[PDB]
Enzyme design. Structure first.
Site, PDB file in Angstrom:
ATOM      1  N   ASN A 144       0.806  -1.221   0.000  1.00 46.95           N
ATOM      2  CA  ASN A 144       0.000   0.000   0.000  1.00 46.95           C
ATOM      3  C   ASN A 144       0.839   1.272   0.000  1.00 46.95           C
ATOM      4  OD1 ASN A 144      -2.677   1.137  -0.047  1.00 46.95           O
ATOM      5  ND2 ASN A 144      -2.353   1.785   2.087  1.00 46.95           N
TER       6      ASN A 144
ATOM      7  N   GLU B  27       1.709  -2.557  -5.369  1.00 50.10           N
ATOM      8  CA  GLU B  27       1.421  -1.158  -5.011  1.00 50.10           C
ATOM      9  C   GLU B  27       2.642  -0.386  -4.471  1.00 50.10           C
ATOM     10  OE1 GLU B  27      -2.576   1.302  -3.542  1.00 50.10           O
ATOM     11  OE2 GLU B  27      -2.339  -0.781  -2.976  1.00 50.10           O
TER      12      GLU B  27
ATOM     13  N   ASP C 110      -2.249  -9.632  -5.268  1.00 50.26           N
ATOM     14  CA  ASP C 110      -3.540  -9.125  -4.804  1.00 50.26           C
ATOM     15  C   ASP C 110      -4.558  -9.285  -5.925  1.00 50.26           C
ATOM     16  OD1 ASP C 110      -5.756  -7.691  -3.840  1.00 50.26           O
ATOM     17  OD2 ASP C 110      -4.696  -5.836  -3.456  1.00 50.26           O
TER      18      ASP C 110
ATOM     19  N   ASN D  29      -7.739  -8.788  -5.575  1.00 47.31           N
ATOM     20  CA  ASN D  29      -8.852  -7.877  -5.259  1.00 47.31           C
ATOM     21  C   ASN D  29     -10.213  -8.554  -5.179  1.00 47.31           C
ATOM     22  OD1 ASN D  29      -7.885  -5.309  -4.487  1.00 47.31           O
ATOM     23  ND2 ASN D  29      -7.540  -4.711  -6.611  1.00 47.31           N
TER      24      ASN D  29
ATOM     25  N   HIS E  80      -2.823  -4.631   3.937  1.00 45.90           N
ATOM     26  CA  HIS E  80      -2.601  -6.031   3.574  1.00 45.90           C
ATOM     27  C   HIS E  80      -1.443  -6.533   4.436  1.00 45.90           C
ATOM     28  CE1 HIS E  80      -4.759  -6.348  -0.411  1.00 45.90           C
ATOM     29  NE2 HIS E  80      -4.579  -5.039  -0.414  1.00 45.90           N
TER      30      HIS E  80
END
Ligand SMILES: [Mg+2]
Ligand SMILES: [Mg+2]
Lengths: 257, 256
Positions: B11, B37, B150, B152, B247
């Site tokens: 993140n 990310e 990820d 999602n 996460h």
DNA sequence: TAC
């Protein structure tokens, strides 16, 4: 020369014998094997189990039948064997073997379990102290020392899956954890932590709720060495795939020239 | 030997760096670390953060500043690195790393988030398809594949605390859930579910309402392998106690 | 708590 030492709480030696312990033994070929929780009466163990070829065996049974006891098999002739710290209440329980192999003394210790009462937690903690005295005295006299066995305590949070749940349970009390800190602080090294810093490395799992296969366990079995001697250890590992007891074995390899 | 791979949506890489990410890194010692990310512009990341000793690093940034991006640190270099499916709109977003380590290709994918609009749900679903095409082609050509990152999406009701509340929200739509069914159906295996069948196993928690500490979360981060290769995975776990992002990391161990 |  490489020297291989294995430590294993067998949770009753007859139990694992029926399970093919002798076959694992011949496969693994340690130079010295340290065993905790024999339970059986030595004199009446199978002959095949007492006299395994290539090894001299030593059994230190408890006064109480079917309880505790330790054992050592060795390819190396020992230059002495001591079976206590010279303190009565600590020496009658079958917890102690101190073997002299010239390059080092080897302590094979089944440390007390503190779960069952407050009396036995005190007894465990005071056993901790008597052991520190003993190993310190031998160490200060110039001897290299290897200590192995079941400490009945996980050192840090990294050493059990369920740390919060057990901060109130014997085996992870802050009192017990501080002693290991103090022990290390006295010039001794947790060999496994010299090579592996990963979590999820355990040596005991509860029999209840498929814990081993869910890998919800504790590291209770250690190889320790004095600081001076640490450069002689080539490896310190956990034999995770060896079954038959609620503990799995642990290995040490030392190089000696 | 035993090879350890870790996947983690950080993140924002600066955000976790400030939070002592480098220290966790040196503690964990993965052979390969996969990060989703990144956000930051690679060329102007800390030198300590670009060149960690013992690792080659690879950054695949988005065209858009402060958005998306992925990264891979690896003790052993790969023989090739591919950064896209060869489809323009899918390859400019910094979502794709495909690294060849001979024994296997490793896909490090930051899958699109569908929450913000209908346009982005379509974009996410079609990214799903382009990825299935790609990994299928590589798999059919005989390669062993590890896919991490990820997704999602939470696959089943077991994979989020609040399933009924979210049956209408992107990340648990039946359309998204069917694609994972179809993906698995194509000969791929959700590694974590080979070892752990318990509920309450999550990789993402909302920052709002102390959700992590109430353990109201989602499994959005997976390690997948092709069927043929599955016997090589020793374990697939969630590193729940690692903080710094919304996460947490996930682990894979394989024996070659 | 999905923003
Ligand atoms: Mg026992
Ligand atoms: Mg994010």
């Amino acid at each position: 020369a490489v020297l291989k030492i294995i430590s294993w709480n067998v949770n009753g030696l007859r139990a694992v014998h029926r399970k093919g312990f002798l076959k694992w033994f011949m496969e693994e070929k340690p130079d010295i094997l340290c065993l905790q929780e024999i339970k059986a009466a030595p004199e009446q163990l199978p002959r095949k189990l007492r006299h395994v070829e290539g090894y001299r065996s030593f059994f230190t049974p408890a006064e109480r039948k079917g309880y505790s006891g330790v054992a050592m098999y060795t390819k190396v002739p020992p230059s002495s064997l001591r079976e206590g710290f010279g303190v009565e209440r600590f020496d009658t329980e079958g917890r102690i073997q101190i073997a002299d192999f010239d390059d080092f003394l080897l302590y094979n210790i089944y440390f007390p379990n503190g779960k069952m009462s407050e009396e036995r937690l005190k007894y465990k903690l005071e056993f901790y102290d008597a052991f520190l005295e003993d190993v310190n005295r031998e160490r200060d006299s110039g001897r290299n020392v290897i200590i192995c066995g079941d400490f009945n305590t996980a050192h840090r949070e990294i050493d059990l899956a369920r740390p919060k749940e057990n901060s109130n349970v014997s085996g992870f009390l802050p009192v017990e954890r501080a002693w290991i800190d103090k022990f290390i602080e006295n010039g001794y090294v947790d060999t496994f932590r010299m090579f592996n810093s990963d979590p999820g490395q355990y040596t005991w799992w509860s029999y209840r709720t498929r814990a081993r296969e869910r890998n919800v366990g504790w590291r209770l079995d250690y190889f320790f060495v004095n600081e001076e001697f640490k450069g002689k250890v080539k490896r310190s590992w956990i034999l995770s795939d060896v079954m038959g007891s609620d503990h799995c074995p642990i290995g040490l390899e030392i190089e000696l020239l």
